[PDB]
Write a protein that binds this ligand. Sequence first.
Ligand SMILES: Nc1ncnc2c1ncn2[C@@H]1O[C@H](COP(=O)(O)OP(=O)(O)OP(=O)(O)O)[C@@H](O)[C@H]1O
Ligand SMILES: [Mn+2]
Length: 245
Amino acid sequence: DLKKIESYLDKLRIKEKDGEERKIYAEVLDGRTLKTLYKLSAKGYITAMGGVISTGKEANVFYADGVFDGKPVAMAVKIYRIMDEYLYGDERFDMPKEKVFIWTEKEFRNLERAKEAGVSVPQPYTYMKNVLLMEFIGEDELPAPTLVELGRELKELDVEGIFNDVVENVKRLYQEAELVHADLSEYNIMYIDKVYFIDMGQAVTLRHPMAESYLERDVRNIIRFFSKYGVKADFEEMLKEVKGE
Ligand SMILES: Nc1ncnc2c1ncn2[C@@H]1O[C@H](COP(=O)(O)OP(=O)(O)OP(=O)(O)O)[C@@H](O)[C@H]1O
Ligand SMILES: [Mn+2]
């Protein structure tokens, strides 16, 4: 399967000179993944695969130039490697390999749902098998920082403003998308000049048995994080603000 990978890496134009990229792509992705990326290029979604943005246990994220809705766009390409409590209980999905494809579709559908409700998430473009294409958040192929990445640079920003941005986005997600993120924290929120929520495969519908418990957890994470930056908030007030109580 190494021969297959190297071949697709050539066809995708992921070159030796493109830094450490070719070695990272060849280890983190597999032949069948790169086949799907090359079918996406052929179909006109991807013009050029770019740098490696993140490598994880569940997912890898890469930059690409691509085309969506007739125009050139910057893309985040998120790829799930080929979870349960967050799938089961979500009735939207009529229940190894196939499981990863559902999860991909799950995240895509959640992005679309959240976006339609007015939540600040990356514009979703398309998915295919284990690959999800979405709006690149950042500039000049540099990803926007997450809240953790921001660090004490937050002290120089309007932290309370950022907090209130976060809360408003959770409230829309809940009241208008009827979803709970379920892994909301400083690690999954990005900021350029407004916050964006990312990482939504696990998000569940308010029909899920655990939605309220996951929501309470999200709220506590956000109060915990912002307490370190001088923002005074109460759990009851934020929860009620979000749930419209
Ligand atoms: N749309 C995007 N635009 C720019 N950067 C992104 C985008 N999506 C993700 N990233 C970057 O890639 C990193 C990893 O993304 P993400 O949080 O979705 O997955 P993960 O935590 O590594 O694994 P998984 O999503 O499957 O749980 C993010 O912290 C962010 O820095
Ligand atoms: Mn994440």
